Amino acid sequence: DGLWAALTEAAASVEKLLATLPEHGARSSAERAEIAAAHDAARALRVRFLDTHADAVYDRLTDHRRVHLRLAELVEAAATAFPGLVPTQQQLAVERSLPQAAKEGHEIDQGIFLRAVLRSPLAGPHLLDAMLRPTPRALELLPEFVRTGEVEMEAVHLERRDGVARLTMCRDDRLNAEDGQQVDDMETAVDLALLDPGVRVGLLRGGVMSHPRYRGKRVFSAGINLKYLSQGGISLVDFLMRRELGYIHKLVRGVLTNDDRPGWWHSPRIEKPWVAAVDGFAIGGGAQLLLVFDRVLASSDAYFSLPAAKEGIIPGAANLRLGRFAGPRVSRQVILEGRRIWAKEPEARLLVDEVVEPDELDAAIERSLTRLDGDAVLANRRMLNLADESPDGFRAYMAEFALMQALRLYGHDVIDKVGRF
């Protein structure tokens, strides 16, 4: 051992330098280099500590894997039980108050933590299962939703109709640009759709926009909120990891329920098929979503892109999933070089099932919904998803992503690009 003590020591040097040095941007080069070196020693020890102790740490927090904790609860509890391993709620609030450029990068420590947890064959699957459980917010809204067929949330409007959960993304002023609230809404809505027994199929679609350049037109997604990202308001844990391990993973695998119904022994998860309809365009996080649907429809004029090839963050699990859809050459053209793919080009058929003229689209969406109803579809989509993406594959990738993305979230190149938007 020796590693916990050495870490505690390196974290204290960091806190002493932060307490004594000037604010970020008033620091000299010597001072900038000193604090960077301190952060580096500490982060190195977080990695080494967790390489050997991750399972024991996770066992402490979850009572030897008998309590499912979601990400936000897990990292908070880790901070209080293991001071210096990951940041406290207080330390985060100071960070959140700063613009990205000025942050110390404490979230990186959370990336280290989550990487180590997800790498573990014991802890990893368990945390993934916790994130497939229904959100409390969704359990609380479920009876009203069953009664009313309707919930209005800040970023998402959800409506049950003809056996379909219609999720409409409705941030009309900013092209459905994504943030932490949207993720919370999306997961909540996805949870409701899955738990509601009067829902047989899901539908995800962008709502009518109100910004002058798009007034009266639907738009699917313009991807991550770049303004908020610059201003410091995009959370590694509560946005970037939450969406991947929560609603998006639930689209694929369903919601993990308690043993409280017949058939649980064969289907612990309630999964349903999902249709996405793309109006205008799907960019970044929105394009990423398409890699998880059972059916994808697009308007003739639409395009699909993951644009931040030069100075962007990793586009979620597109690096995991895209290759299976498009092969390695196209996958690199899209992600490494920012190739944008139009609905009407032949290669769109790698991502999109049906491309339809704007005036034929509503009806085509309605028909697609009726084709995905039965139990044969449920069984087949489950078997298809299992073959397409193994639980190990997903876990291994999300483990490395957790840290790789954390590092990109603080990269100088990203902070600069994002500040210019």
Ligand X SMILES: CC(C)(COP(=O)(O)OP(=O)(O)OC[C@H]1O[C@@H](n2cnc3c(N)ncnc32)[C@H](O)[C@@H]1OP(=O)(O)O)[C@@H](O)C(=O)NCCC(=O)NCCNC(=O)Cc1cc(O)cc(O)c1
Coil, helix or strand for 363?
helix
Contact 299, 356 (CB under 8 A): yes
How far apart are alpha carbons 304 and 379 in whole angstroms?
Answer: 30
Is 231 among the annotated ligand-binding positions? no
Residues 6+ positions from 43 with CB-CB distance below 8 Å? 108, 109, 112
Q: Name the pairing type of β-strands 269-270 and 164-169.
A: unpaired
3-state secondary structure of 337: coil
Binder of residue 175, out of ligand X, a second copy, none (CB less than 5 to 8 A by kind) = ligand X
Residue 163 or residue 358: which is nearer to a second copy going by CB? Answer: 358
388 marked as binding residue: no
Nearer of residues 213 and 412 to a second copy, judged by Cβ: 213
Number of residues lying near a second copy (CB under 8 A): 3
Which residue number is nearest to ligand X in terms of Cβ?
Answer: 284
- If one asks whether residue 359 binds a second copy (CB under 8 A), the answer comes out as no
The residues binding ligand X (CB under 6 A) are 174-175, 177-178, 211, 213, 222-227, 240, 243, 283-285, 307-308, 312-316
Q: How far is the CB of 215 from a second copy (least distance, A)?
A: 8
Between residues 32 and 215, which has the closer beta carbon with respect to a second copy? 215
* Cβ neighbour number for residue 2 with a 10 Å cutoff: 8
Q: Is 53 annotated as a binding residue?
A: no
Among positions 186-245, residues that touch a second copy (CB under 8 A) are: 212-213, 215
Residue 254 or 285: the one with the smaller Cβ distance to ligand X is 285
With respect to a second copy, which residue has the nearer C-beta, 145 or 220? 220
- For residue 226, say whether it is annotated as part of any ligand binding site: yes
The tokens for 170 are 């409705």
The reply, when asked if residue 288 is annotated as ligand binding, is no
Smallest gap from Cβ 306 to ligand X, in A, equals 7
Q: Please tell me the distance from the alpha carbon of residue 343 to that of residue 330, in angstroms, as a whole number.
A: 15
Q: What are the start-end ranges of the H helices in 199-356?
A: 226-231, 242-245, 247-253, 285-289, 318-335
CB-wise, 212 or 263, nearer to a second copy? Answer: 212
Neighbours of 25 (CB within 10 A): 9
Which of the listed partners (a second copy, ligand X, none) does 224 bind, with a CB threshold of 5 to 8 Å by partner kind? ligand X
SS (H, E, C) 101-135: HHCCCCHHHHHHHHHHHHHCCCHHHHHHHHHHCCC
To a second copy, the closest distance from the beta carbon of 169 in angstroms equals 22
| Chosen from a second copy, ligand X, none, partner binding at 285 (C-beta under 5 to 8 Å by type) | ligand X
Phi, psi of 23 (to 5 degrees): -60, 160
316 annotated binding-site participant: yes
Neighbouring C-alpha atoms within 13 Å toward the C-beta of 171: 19
Binding site for a second copy (CB under 8 A): 212-213, 215
Instruction: Name the binding residues for substrate.
Output: 172, 178, 211-214, 222-227, 285, 314-316, 405
Instruction: Name the binding residues.
Output: 172, 178, 211-214, 222-227, 285, 314-316, 405
